[PDB]
Amino acid sequence: FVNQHLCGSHLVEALYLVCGERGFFYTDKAAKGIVEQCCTSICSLYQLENYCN
Amino acid sequence: FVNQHLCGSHLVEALYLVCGERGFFYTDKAAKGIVEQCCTSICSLYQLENYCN
Amino acid sequence: FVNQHLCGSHLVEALYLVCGERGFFYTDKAAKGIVEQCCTSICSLYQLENYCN
Amino acid sequence: FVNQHLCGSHLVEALYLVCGERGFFYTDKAAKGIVEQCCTSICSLYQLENYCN
Amino acid sequence: FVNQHLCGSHLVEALYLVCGERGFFYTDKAAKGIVEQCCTSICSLYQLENYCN
Amino acid sequence: FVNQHLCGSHLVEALYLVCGERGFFYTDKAAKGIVEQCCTSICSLYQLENYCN
Numbered sequence: 001f002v003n004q005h006l007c008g009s010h011l012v013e014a015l016y017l018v019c020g021e022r023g024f025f026y027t028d029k030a031a032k033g034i035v036e037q038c039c040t041s042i043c044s045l046y047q048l049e050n051y052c053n
Numbered sequence: 054f055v056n057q058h059l060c061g062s063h064l065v066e067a068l069y070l071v072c073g074e075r076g077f078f079y080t081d082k083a084a085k086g087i088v089e090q091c092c093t094s095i096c097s098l099y100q101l102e103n104y105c106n
Numbered sequence: 107f108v109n110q111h112l113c114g115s116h117l118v119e120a121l122y123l124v125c126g127e128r129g130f131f132y133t134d135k136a137a138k139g140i141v142e143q144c145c146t147s148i149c150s151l152y153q154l155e156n157y158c159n
Numbered sequence: 160f161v162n163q164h165l166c167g168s169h170l171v172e173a174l175y176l177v178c179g180e181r182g183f184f185y186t187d188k189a190a191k192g193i194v195e196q197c198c199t200s201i202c203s204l205y206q207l208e209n210y211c212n
Numbered sequence: 213f214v215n216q217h218l219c220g221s222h223l224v225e226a227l228y229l230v231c232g233e234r235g236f237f238y239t240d241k242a243a244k245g246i247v248e249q250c251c252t253s254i255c256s257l258y259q260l261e262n263y264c265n
Numbered sequence: 266f267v268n269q270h271l272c273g274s275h276l277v278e279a280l281y282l283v284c285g286e287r288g289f290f291y292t293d294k295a296a297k298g299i300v301e302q303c304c305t306s307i308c309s310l311y312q313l314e315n316y317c318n
């Protein structure tokens with residue numbers, strides 16, 4: 001299956017909208033961690049914000 | 054018109070695909086170079102990879 | 107106008123995300139309205155939350 | 160739960176194209192009948208139009 | 213203003229929508245023809261179904 | 266299940282990007298093949314490049 005890669009693609013658009021001019025880092029380090037958590041169960045806007053810069 | 058925000062929305066999706074495992078950082082102060090270049094001309098995928106982590 | 111058509115396709119997705127469970131209507135009166143407000147210059151997340159139900 | 164969220168995001172972009180200047184409702188009541196029918200099986204464009212306002 | 217490269221990505225999505233397993237027959241003249249006409253005036257789904265195969 | 270129709274919309278977006286102004290070609294067979302291969306495991310951009318014209 002290709003579930004997480006398909007989930008990744010929507011989660012960066014959500015971090016571009018949530019994060020704004022603060023931006024975000026989607027790097028191998030703490031980006032496999034937003035996938036472990038937000039592609040397993042639905043993350044709210046405030047849980048998404050904790051990955052912002 | 055929100056020309057920057059609509060071009061920036063496509064650019065984050067193109068970067069998720071081209072950077073793959075390298076990932077990237079999208080700071081609105083690091084996102085100025087890649088919007089100024091790639092929203093006024095079509096960037097190759099090699100050009101996009103120059104912004105990967 | 108096609109640039110308003112395309113902006114509105116991105117606006118439908120951001121309201122889906124911001125409005126969570128609540129949802130939103132995209133009747134041709136709220137549409138005209140969010141289009142004029144938020145495709146002419148950017149909208150913050152508060153502003154978009156105001157169109158949600 | 161993330162799978163139906165993923166699906167709903169792509170159905171909102173389909174309803175925006177199919178309904179045109181009609182528009183559509185996508186509140187929690189309105190759009191849960193849609194997801195039951197169109198996220199378990201594939202809906203055509205003629206079935207999606209039933210949900211236009 | 214319409215950036216034609218960002219408009220084309222939306223149009224390729226729409227034809228996937230419209231044509232689905234019918235596909236299309238690719239020729240440079242039809243490709244440039246669709247992006248010229250539907251990136252300057254809005255095309256409806258019934259205009260886009262003409263390009264399906 | 267709608268999962269392969271959803272994967273297929275994301276491949277279309279990644280062939281548009283990768284192929285650029287060369288565009289891509291459709292046949293019944295290759296459309297069956299890239300979904301059975303790229304919706305089962307992650308295809309690179311250098312594998313997708315084989316369907317561009």
Ligand SMILES: Cc1cccc(O)c1
Pocket residue numbers: 007010011014038039041042043044123161
């Ligand atoms: C907004 C969003 C996208 C993908 C997964 C999530 O949990 C939430």
Ligand SMILES: Cc1cccc(O)c1
Pocket residue numbers: 060063064067090091092094095096097218282
């Ligand atoms: C949106 C986008 C993708 C790829 C190249 C570009 O210049 C712009």
Ligand SMILES: Cc1cccc(O)c1
Pocket residue numbers: 055058113116117120143144145147148149150
């Ligand atoms: C498309 C869009 C997204 C978010 C804010 C805007 O003003 C316009």
Ligand SMILES: Cc1cccc(O)c1
Pocket residue numbers: 166169170173197198200201202267
């Ligand atoms: C077009 C579309 C998107 C998502 C679910 C569907 O049944 C159909």
Ligand SMILES: Cc1cccc(O)c1
Pocket residue numbers: 224225227228229230231232233234235236277291296
């Ligand atoms: C653009 C596209 C891709 C695959 C099938 C289609 O009908 C249309």
Ligand SMILES: Cc1cccc(O)c1
Pocket residue numbers: 108176219222223226250251253254255256
């Ligand atoms: C469906 C769609 C996308 C892009 C431009 C158009 O005129 C129509």
Ligand SMILES: Cc1cccc(O)c1
Pocket residue numbers: 220224227236238243280281284285287288289
């Ligand atoms: C049908 C089609 C049109 C334009 C670009 C593409 O990559 C494919």
Ligand SMILES: Cc1cccc(O)c1
Pocket residue numbers: 002070272275276279302303304306307308309
């Ligand atoms: C880029 C991409 C999209 C969808 C499936 C894949 O295997 C690879």
Ligand SMILES: [Cl-]
Pocket residue numbers: 006007165166271272
């Ligand atoms: Cl998806």
Ligand SMILES: [Cl-]
Pocket residue numbers: 059060112113218219
């Ligand atoms: Cl756009």
Ligand SMILES: [Zn+2]
Pocket residue numbers: 006010165169271275
């Ligand atoms: Zn998706």
Ligand SMILES: [Zn+2]
Pocket residue numbers: 059063112116218222
């Ligand atoms: Zn766009």
